[PDB]
């Protein structure tokens, strides 16, 4: 019942037979911007199925010495499909997300991944007074890896990261995690190329281990923008 789940958005569908419920961030569901909160007066474009669909990123390899991975939204999707085109052709963007993380193994494997969505994950640099640069933050589709996951790369604690919307992938229990993110920002809309509302982090708290024959164990991320809308149409930046 709570272990099987089908997600269908646009022309895309995902089925999992080993889910563990799914998390709605702060008990909220994505929605379009209402008139009593709107600021931009131009009529927005709402592509619906053209942009509200699952985009699958490149898989990463779960290794013994893996420290963790992160992707920043909407930066990771800003050059992908019709969502990327609408982002490039518009000054203002607004949407939620539906994140589905996939990682399967055998019943002889062990391991635990914390899959956490951090709002405004302002990263810090290690052992220097210089702030992180543009290239350190904006990794796009490929994402980045945690330098010090123990402190979430920002001087805080990984132990308290459960205060953020999150799930676990415990290999003996489940093979996927699902998180629904509403619009999370101080402003009703934002310039998608210079600010990231959310950061998806996957951290191997319990390392992958087995004594059976070793196989490549990938982790795959599928993200579906939800209730997309764009304002301020102009020429493409790209």
């Amino acid at each position: 019942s709570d272990r099987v789940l089908q997600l269908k958005l646009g022309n895309s569908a995902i089925v999992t037979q080993e889910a563990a419920n799914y998390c709605c961030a702060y008990g909220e569901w994505p929605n379009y911007l209402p008139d009593h909160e709107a600021v931009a007066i131009d009529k927005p474009t709402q592509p619906e199925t053209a942009t509200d669909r699952f985009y699958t990123l490149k898989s990463v390899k779960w290794e013994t010495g893996s420290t963790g991975w992160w992707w920043k939204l909407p930066d990771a999707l800003n050059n992908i499909g019709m969502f990327g085109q609408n982002v490039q052709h518009h000054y203002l963007y607004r949407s939620g997300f539906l994140i589905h993380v996939q990682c399967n193994a055998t019943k002889f494997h062990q391991g635990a991944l914390l899959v956490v969505a951090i709002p405004e994950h302002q990263r810090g640099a290690h052992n220097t007074n210089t702030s992180p640069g543009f290239d350190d933050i904006m990794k796009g589709e490929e994402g980045g890896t945690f330098n010090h996951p123990y402190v979430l790369d920002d001087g805080t604690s990984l132990a308290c990261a459960t205060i953020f919307p999150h799930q676990w992938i415990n290999l003996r229990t489940n093979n996927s995690a699902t998180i629904v993110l509403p619009w999370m920002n101080a402003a009703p809309m934002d310039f998608p190329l210079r600010h990231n509302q959310w950061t998806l982090a996957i951290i191997p708290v319990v390392p992958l281990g087995t004594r059976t024959t070793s196989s490549m164990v990938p982790i795959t991320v599928s993200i579906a923008p939800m209730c997309c809308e764009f304002n301020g149409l102009r020429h493409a930046i790209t």
């Binding site: 272990r3 419920n21 998390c23 709605c24 961030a25 702060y26 008990g27 205060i163």
Partner: protein, 39 residues
Amino acid sequence: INFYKDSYAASASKQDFSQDPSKFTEPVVEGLKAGAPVL
């Protein structure tokens, strides 16, 4: 005592006892019934 004309000049407001911890403790679509297995 607030004789100022701007409402933001007023003293602190310490009377909002409303809470909703479930938005952080149980942010799941399917509520978990007490006693029954979660999965």
